[PDB]
Amino acid sequence: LNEKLKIEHAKKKRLFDLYINGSYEVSELDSMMNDIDAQINYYEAQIEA
Amino acid sequence: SLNEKLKIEHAKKKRLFDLYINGSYEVSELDSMMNDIDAQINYYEAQIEA
């Protein structure tokens, strides 16, 4: 399930893509991006330990 | 209708810059897409040369 990390990271590149094209605002991007970053940490740690 | 692509890129550039002034996020994340955004502005300029 290391792929999921790329998938969660792939979602990050896209989430930036959307905002840059105006589909998502800054205020939203705050909540949505940190959710991913947390989801990564949620899946980043205590699996390679 | 290739002339009016830079204004979109500038809008694409602005939005991105609003994340820097917002202050959060990692700058290296924002630098990778800016490298693509700045470059796309470059070609639109360069095509006018010839």
3-state secondary structure labels for all residues of A15-36: HHHHHHCCCCCHHHHHHHHHHH
The structure's method of determination equals: X-ray
Contact (Cβ atoms closer than 8 angstroms) between residue A14 and residue A33: no
Nearest C-alpha of chain B: how many angstroms from A21? Answer: 6
Contact (Cβ atoms closer than 8 angstroms) between residue B27 and residue B20: yes
**Best residue in B25, B27, B31, B36 for a mutation probing chain A (most A CBs within 10 Å):** B25
Nearest C-alpha of chain B: how many angstroms from A20? Answer: 5
Angle between helices B6-22 and A3-20 (to 10 degrees): 110
The number of folded domains in chain B is 1
Q: Kindly provide the residue ranges of all beta strands, DSSP E only, lying in A1-49, ordered along the sequence.
A: none
The type of residue at A36 is I
Sign of CA dihedral A45, A40, B14, B40: positive
Q: Which domain holds residue A4?
A: 1-49
Contact list, A29 vs chain B (CB under 8 Å): 19
Q: In Å, what resolution does this model reach?
A: 2.0
Compute and round to an integer the Cα radius of gyration of chain A: 12
Could you give the 3-state DSSP secondary structure of residue B23? coil
Contact (Cβ atoms closer than 8 angstroms) between residue B16 and residue A20: yes
DSSP H or E stretch at residue A44: helix A26-44
CA B36 from centroid of its chain's CA atoms: 7
